[PDB]
Amino acid sequence: TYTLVWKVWILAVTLYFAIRIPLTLVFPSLFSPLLPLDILASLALIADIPLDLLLAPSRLPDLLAALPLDLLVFALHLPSPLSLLSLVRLLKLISVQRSATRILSYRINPALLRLLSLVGFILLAAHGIACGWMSLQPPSENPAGTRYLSAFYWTITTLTTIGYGDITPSTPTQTVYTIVIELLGAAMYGLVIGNIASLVSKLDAAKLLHRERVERVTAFLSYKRISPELQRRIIEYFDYLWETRRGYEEREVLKELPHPLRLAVAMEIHGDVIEKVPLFKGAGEEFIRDIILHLEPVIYGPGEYIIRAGEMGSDVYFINRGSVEVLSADEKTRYAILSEGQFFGEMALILRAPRTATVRARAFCDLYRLDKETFDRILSRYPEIAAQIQELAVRRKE
Amino acid sequence: TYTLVWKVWILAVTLYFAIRIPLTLVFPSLFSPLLPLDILASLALIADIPLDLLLAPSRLPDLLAALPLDLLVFALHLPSPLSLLSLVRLLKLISVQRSATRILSYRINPALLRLLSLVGFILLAAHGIACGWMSLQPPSENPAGTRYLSAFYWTITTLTTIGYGDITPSTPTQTVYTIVIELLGAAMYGLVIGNIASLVSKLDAAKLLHRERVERVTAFLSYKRISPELQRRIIEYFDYLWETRRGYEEREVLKELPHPLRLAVAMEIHGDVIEKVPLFKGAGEEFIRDIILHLEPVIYGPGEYIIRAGEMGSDVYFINRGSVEVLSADEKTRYAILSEGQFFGEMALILRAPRTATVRARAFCDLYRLDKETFDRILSRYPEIAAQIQELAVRRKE
Amino acid sequence: TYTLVWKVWILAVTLYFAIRIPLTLVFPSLFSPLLPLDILASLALIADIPLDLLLAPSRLPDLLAALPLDLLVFALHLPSPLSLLSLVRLLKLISVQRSATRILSYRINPALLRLLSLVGFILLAAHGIACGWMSLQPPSENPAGTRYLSAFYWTITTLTTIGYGDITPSTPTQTVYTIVIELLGAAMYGLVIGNIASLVSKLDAAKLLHRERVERVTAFLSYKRISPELQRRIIEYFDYLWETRRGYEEREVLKELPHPLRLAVAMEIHGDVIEKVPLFKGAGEEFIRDIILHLEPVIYGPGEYIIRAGEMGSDVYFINRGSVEVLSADEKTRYAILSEGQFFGEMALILRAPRTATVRARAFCDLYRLDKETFDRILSRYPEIAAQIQELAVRRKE
Amino acid sequence: TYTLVWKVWILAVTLYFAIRIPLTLVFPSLFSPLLPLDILASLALIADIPLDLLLAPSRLPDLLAALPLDLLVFALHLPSPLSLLSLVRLLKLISVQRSATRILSYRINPALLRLLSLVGFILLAAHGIACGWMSLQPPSENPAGTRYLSAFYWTITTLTTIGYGDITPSTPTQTVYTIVIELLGAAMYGLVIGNIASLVSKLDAAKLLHRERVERVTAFLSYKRISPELQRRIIEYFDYLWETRRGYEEREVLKELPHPLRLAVAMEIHGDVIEKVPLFKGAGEEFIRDIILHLEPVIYGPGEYIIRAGEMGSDVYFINRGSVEVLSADEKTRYAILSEGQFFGEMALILRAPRTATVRARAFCDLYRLDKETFDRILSRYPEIAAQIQELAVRRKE
Ligand SMILES: Nc1ncnc2c1ncn2[C@@H]1O[C@@H]2COP(=O)(O)O[C@H]2[C@H]1O
Ligand SMILES: Nc1ncnc2c1ncn2[C@@H]1O[C@@H]2COP(=O)(O)O[C@H]2[C@H]1O
Structure with a gap:
């Protein structure tokens, strides 16, 4: 984090400059007691080219803002149109914005951080425009406080497109400036409107995508006027998915x-699931690499028929959370309850036999769907695992 | 519904608070005759933690708004900067909004309900801002009516970005407040603009999706300048789909x-279709589970050639609504009309024969497309059903 | 078109009402010389229930606006709060909007027509609000002209969120009305902003979709800095597609x-292509039905290698527009030029031989890609066509 | 570029007209010293019909703006309602906008260029509206400077929906004009708001698409709280993709x-890769055509297991940038390092043998995935290349 402090310092110094230079263009009486701060700021501004690890079409602003055009224009008391060149330090804003975009710890949303950057930029521009408006004002015997508060109030009035009209331009040189910043205020307000209009669907993107996915299903299913118990259980499944995976499908993100x-x-x-399954406890460095990508999580409700008797299902379902019970062909007697760690349906591919009994979950079971082809491949590739699987299968027969 | 009344009561009490505290911060003369209401409100605010079934990073507002900071600041007559702490009850707004989001009966659109929540929030904020503006006003001998109506009128003027300018700030402490709520009004109006800009395509999502799907097809087909009779029948089919399935495809919603x-x-x-088909009347608990997912509804117009003679079509079409007639190889003689309940094309897979005669609908027939593979699987899995199907096939031969 | 005139008449009469009733609520001196118009309007309003081919949750407005609450409130001179009931005719607006949405000849864009309907609605609401504002004004000796022009100017000022502030409310009963229509103006302006923000990508949807599709390809390809001749020919192909199919792919629209x-x-x-191909001239009613859906149009530039020698291409390419030349194995001698009507590559599937010579287009050839499977199916299904195809193949051998 | 100068000239002359005619409608005292400019402009406006390579429903504006309605209305001093016809030259704007849309060198973004065109159009409309407002003003003894600056300031005030209200209409003929341009300003500001709201996601479309693709993956993966080293390497891979292909997938663009x-x-x-691979140096004009489309670039990190021992991988990986080392079955000894130019895994399909040793990259290797089917096809189609491949395979065996 030796660069986080440096980046914070450079942001602070460039913000200090962007606040400070125009305020002393309007008020020449300053810059006399703040010389050490400007000296340190200039030193920091030149001392970042070798610490950022030459001329470029995009890295020019660094040198354009490092050159000491400041502390010189006020020193020689240049005329205002010629002393206006001191505003070159404002080009450091692009570089600090890019740097802050390239470094993060919270991983802020790009649209929300863009809106925050725009908020900072419009506030800085409001200060600059207020100072500019204050510059071309008739001289008066007023404190700099009220004289700047009124100017900032007017600038925030125009850039917000409110326009009370209590204070208005009264000279042509003021009227041209008023028109220019009226157009700029229209543009800036348009940019802000577009930024919120885009951002409303950018923060917590999962929280909105899941809601939009659920809404259409719920609307159609309620339109069909199906049994309300099914509504309740479907909504329960959806909120459980919201709680567990935050409305995610793994292939939606891993397919890139x-x-x-x-x-x-x-x-x-x-x-x-690598750590709890009995036959996966140190089964092999490679075998887990082949199998771990294929296990597809499936979710079932409290009492749903997992696999019915007489079916030709040839897929093994693992257990990650939940208890599963199996009901025999007399639909009254249960063999046992299968909690986490074990599986079921092993005697479907090896034994080439139909489903001996119906199997149903209890509350909410997190499974791991495995295709018959992958099972066949691992059986024909690893022999000890096939021997063990047949061992538990023949044991469960007894 | 024992919790709906409780949630309505908590919404009412939190709205009453959010309306009431600032109005008595500006007007200390109140709070004297409304003590029983505040006592009951405080009791209700503390009596919801055990009725909602500890400290959390997200459940803190409940305790922060249950603590009785109210009925104490006015009692001891604290100074305004120190008595400002009473506004903690406004944090209950987050919790009531979340609760109302988690409970519904109409299943309101999330965007439209979000806009309704924003409307409520901006109205509440308008009241709060109006009371605040009224607070830092010069003392005057005016009734609280006109004195509050003017303040609310001014607040709604600024937050709407209209700004008539009849009443404007005149003191620096008022000017800073004016700037702050000008910025807040810009932000709130931007949020509202974004909310409508998003909501225009969120209410009755099917009604807009179907329209957008139909529009491109109609535009292209009219550009090709094809025969207007085909236009009429295509538009008739599309509006019939609008009337029947509300512009839906089943796989668009069931694939999640x-x-x-x-x-x-x-x-x-x-x-x-389970209840009317002759051979599906109690055919089996399991068989319907295998077959019911595969029947794909198909829709044909008044006179369209369903299946022509000489084809190798091997799919059985069921009937759910409509009459179907079959025209023989002499294209003059019809065998009969097939209303709802029966099917056609049975003697295509079992008999391994080509289409004996042309079959056409009459007005609008709702069919049920079944693939040859599923038909073969059910024939090879259920033998009595195959016997019955061959029975009706050989009967139709005679 | 016997209903188009009726619908135009009903739109005209409902617009006349919506303009007329409030204008006479403010001005009671009217309604005396316009009795025949109101009588005819009332007759037309009751005479549409049997001409539209009972009580419904959505067809209620028709009866609610047909009842003659008008021509009675002014007749008995009811008080304004009680005579306000005459505004029920404004509910006919929903029905006329729905009717105009359900009938079209140009097939106007739904978003653009929605914006036109919103423009009409906001203009009508502006007139109504102006009349309302005029109602609660102090009595004055002014002509109805200037007295209504000022009110409409004020209403358009508030609903546009401009607010000059030259004329402002001055009484509490006016201030409440000002607040209400300020909120309504915010909502209406938000709706309009959302409508344009959505409509910018709704008019001429093909013209924008094609542009967006071309833009990304052009940007990436120019970034790669590939040979500019390839740029020129790619852009030429894209604009030719724009001219011919208007940036369309057939499967993009026919797959619904x-x-x-x-x-x-x-x-x-x-x-x-049915009418010009030699062997398709009345080939068969059914055969065209099997083949016509599969021909996929392909487009090639001026000089591109269609099929090179030595390849195992087994697809027949038809011609719809353009000339094609074939270059032999000596890459100097051409057999002929194949204009519209014929094809090439026939001696690829029947003869089981490789590509005898290279074939190239001349300027821009519109082809018809046919898969080998469909060709095999039609050859094994229709024998005369196979005989003819082999006849031209063996002829081209000689 | 003989037409670029002509198009620039036509844009300049049409802009000059659009600026000039209304300014002389308000000020008749002009048009006396600018006759040669108008003569040259008229000549240029008529001299573009034969230089653009008759009557059309879309090419009418060219003739409508070429006709010399100008230099005649001022000459005969027609009345203002009748001399208003001179504004026909403003229809040339559509044609110049279309022409500038059809010709480019930078390939400007269509949305950004549309916003630039809208900016130009609203500025031109602001000038026209300002001149119009100046026209119906009471006569005064003021310089044309201040008299036009005030009018333009007022026009920019209304079209921005600010409305200070310092200068407002005072006559009914002015009030109607104020209402008309208030509505037009609402529409124009709405269009601008929609244009920025759309454009925020149109400029540098790759730069935003890549960011949005990365953001969801990073958010989900950080939510899972997986090992930070994996975070670092994943982010490094993503930024390397940003640097190399600018966040692109080839099939995303070439599939059109x-x-x-x-x-x-x-x-x-x-x-x-055609130029550096040993056996591809002039291998064949056709062979590269068959193979070059199938090579799929793959990217691996610094140390990732490319292919482990014991696998049945049958795909050849080429090298475009990077060094690859192979670790034998003793996981201590490396055979060599494979830099750019060579490949590995050749002895997988020809030899029908499993992976003899584990192969891993070093820093970042750009590969070229080739499927087994294409390899088999080229081996069975080209025999010398198969002989050479077997030669290097048997050499690598030794
Ligand atoms: N005695 C038993 N106790 C528990 N589970 C059993 C027993 N016998 C079989 N099963 C499991 O129940 C499953 C139901 O039929 P399957 O073919 O899916 O595979 C079966 C076994 O996994
Ligand atoms: N006598 C008949 N009456 C009614 N329908 C018949 C008769 N004979 C055949 N069909 C049906 O007409 C269909 C047309 O040919 P298919 O092969 O599709 O299958 C045929 C039968 O389903």
Whole structure:
């Protein structure tokens, strides 16, 4: 974090400049007691080119704002049209904005941070415009307080497109300035309106995407006027998904990363099911790499028929959270309850037999769907695991 | 509904507070005759933590607004900067908004309800800002009526970005407040503009999606300048779809729910075709589970050629609404008219024969497309149903 | 068009009412010389229930606006709060808007027509609000002209959120009205802003979709800095597509219509290629139905290698516009030029031989891609066509 | 570029007209010393019909603006309602806008250029409206400077919806004009708001699409709270993609161009890998055409396991940038480092053998994924290349 302090310091110094130079263009009486601050600021502004690790079509602003055009124009008392060149330090704003965009810790939303940057920019521009309006005013015997408060109030009035009209321009040189910043205020307010209009669907993107996905389903299903119990259980499933995965589907996000990053993410996510399954306890460094990407999580409600008897289902379902009970062919007797760690349906592919009994969940079971092809591949590739699987299968037969 | 009344009561009491505290900050003469209401309100505010079924990073506002900072600041007559702490009750707004978001009966559109919440929030903020503006006003001998009406009129003027300018700030302490709420009014108006700009395509989402889908097809087809009779029949089909399914495709909505919820929804929707088809009358608890998801509804116009003679079509079409006639190879003689309940094309897969005669609808027939693979699977899985199907096939031969 | 005149008449009469009733609420001196117009209007308003081919949750406004509450309140000179009931005729606006939405000849864009309806509604509301503001004004000796022009000017000032402030409310009963229509003006201006913000990408949807599709390709390809000749020819192809199909892909629009409408549209579009190809001149009523949906149009530039020698291409390319030349294995000698009507590549599937010579277009050739599977199916289904195709193939061998 | 100068000249002359005619409608004293400019302008306006390579429903404005209605109305001193016809030259604006839309060199963004055109149009309309407002003003002894500056200031006030209210209409003929341009200002400001609201996501579309794609992945992955080293390497991969391909996937853009343009683009992009690979140095004109479209670039991090031992991988990976090392079965000894130019995994399909050793990258390797099917096709189609590949394979065995 040796660069976070430096970046904070550079942001503070560039903000100090952007606040300070116009305020002394209007008020030449300043700049006399603030010389050490300006000296330190100039030193910091020149001392960032070697610390940021030459001329570029995009890295020019750094040198354009490091040159000491300040502390010289006031010193020689140049005329205002010629002393206006001191505003070059305002070009450092682009560089500090880019730097703050390239460094983060919270990972702020790009649209919300863009709106924050626009808020900062419009506040800074409001201060600059207020100072400018104050500059071309008739001389008066007023304190700088009320004289600046009135100017800032007028600038915020025009840039907000409110326009009370209590104070208005009265000279042509003021009228041209009023027109220019009226147009700029229209543009800036338009940019802000567009920024909120875009941002309303950018913050907590999952929280809005899940809501929009649920809304259409609920509307159509309520229009069909289906049984309210089904409504209740569907809404319960959807809010449980909201609580567990935050309205996510894994393939919605992992289908962009390349293969090794995808493998690493899958391992760091499914280390749990790697750690609790009996035959996966140190089964192999490679085997987990082949299998971990294929397990597709499935979610079932409290009492739903997982697999009915007589079916030709050839897929093994693992358990990550929940208890599962199996009901035999007499639909009265249950063999046992299968909590986390075990699975069911093993005697479907190896044994080439139909579903011996109906299996149903209890409250909410997090499963792991595995396709028959992957199961066949791992059985034909790893023999000890196939031997163990047949061992538990023949044990469950007894 | 024992919680709906409680939630309505909590909304009413928090709205009463949000309206009441600032109005007595400006007017200390109140709070003397409204003590029982405040006592009951305080009791209700503390009596919701055990009735909502500890400290949390998101459940803090409940305790922050339950603490009785009210009925004490006015009692001891604290100074205004120190008595300003009584506004903590306004944090209950977040909790009541969240609660109202989590409970519904009409299933209001999230964007429209968000706009309603924003309307309520901006009205409440307008009242608060009006009371605040009234607070820092010069003392005058005016009734509280006109004195509050003028303040609210001014607040609604600034927050709407209209600014007539009949009444304007005249002191620096008023000018700073004017600037602050000018910025807040810009932000709030921007939020409202974004909310309507988003909401214009959120209410009755089907009614707009269907319109947008129809518009491009109609525009292109009219550009091609094809025969107007085809225009008329296409538009008739589209409006019939609007009337029947409200511009919906089943797979557009069912492709997100898991398998058992999808099965349950399919049964609750297609119980009709389950109930009228002759061989589906109590055919089996399981068989309907296998078949009901695959029947794809198809819609044909008044006179369209369903299946022409000589084709190798191997799909059975059911009937849900409408009459279908079959024209023989002499294109003059019709065998009969097939109303709801029966089907056609059975002697295509079992008999391995081509289409014996042309079949056409009459006005608008709702069919049920079934693929050859599913038909083969059910024939090879259920034998009595295959026997019955061959029975009606050989009967129709005679 | 016997209903277009009736709908125009009903729109005219409801607009006349919506303009007329408030203007006589403010001005009671009217309604004396306009009795025949009101009588005819009332007759027309009651005489539409049997001509529109009972009580409904959505068809209530028709009866609510047909009842003659007008011509009675002015007759008995009811008090203003009680005579305010005459505004029920304004509910006919919903019905006329719905009717105009359900009938069209130009097929106006739904968003642009929605904006036109909103423009009409806001103008009508501006007139109503101006009349209302005029109602609660102090009595004065002014002509109704200037007295209404000032009121309408004020109403358009507030609803536009401009607020000059030359004329402002001065009584509490006026101030409440000012606040109410200030809020309504905010809402209406927000709706208008959202409507344009949505409409900017709704008019001539093809003209914008094609532009957006071309822009990304051009930007990326220019970024790669590839040879400018390729830029020129790619842009030429894209503008030719703009001129010919208006930036369309057939499957983008036909993938929503059902099978028979799709067949009919395909026939009405490809009757040209049906009419010019030698072996398609009355080939068969059914054969065109099987083939016409599969021909995929392909577009090639001036000189592009259609099919090179030595390839295993097994697809027949038809010609709809353009000349095609074939270059032999000596890359100097051309057999002929193939204009519209014929095809090439026939001796690829029947003969099971590789591409005998290279074939290239001349300026811009509109082809018709046909897959090998469909060609095989039609050859194995229709024998005379296969005989003819082999006849031209063996002829081209000689 | 013989037409760029002509188009610039026509834009300049039409802008000069649009600025000039209303300014002399208000000020008849002009048009006396500017006759040569108007003569040259008229000549240029008539001399563009034969230089643009008759009557059309869309090409009418050219003739409507070429006719010399100017230099005649002022000459005969027609009355203002009758001399108002001179504004026909403003219809040339549509044609110049269309022409500038059809010709470009920078390939400006259509939305940003549309906003620039709207800015130009609203500025021109502001000038026209200011001149119009100046026209119907009471006569006064004021210089044309202040008299026009005030009018333009007022016009920019109304069209920005600010409305200070320092200068307001005072006559009914002025009030009607004020209402008309108030409505027009509402419409124009709405259009501008919509244009920025759309443009915020149109400039540098790749720069925003890549950011939005990265944001959701980063948010979800940080929510899972996976190991920060994986965060660092994933972010490094994403920024490297930003630097190399600018956040692009080739199939995202090439899946719209037809086959020959796609082939040409692929050759112009992959001429590098064509030029450096040993066996691709002039391998064949056709072979590169078959292979160049299939090579899919893959990117791996510094140390990632490319292909582990014991796998059945049958795909050859080429090298475009980076060094690759292979670790043997003793996981301590490396055979060599494979820099750009060579490949690995050749002895996987020809030899029908499993992966002899583990292969890993070093810093960041740009590969070229080739499917087994394409490799088999080229081996069975080109025999010398297969002989050479087997030669290097058997050499690498030794
Ligand atoms: N005795 C048993 N106790 C618990 N589970 C069992 C028992 N016998 C079988 N099962 C499981 O119940 C499942 C239901 O039928 P399957 O073919 O899916 O595979 C079966 C086994 O996994
Ligand atoms: N005598 C008949 N009466 C009614 N329908 C018939 C008769 N004979 C055949 N059909 C139906 O007409 C259909 C047309 O040919 P298919 O092969 O589709 O299957 C045929 C039967 O379903």
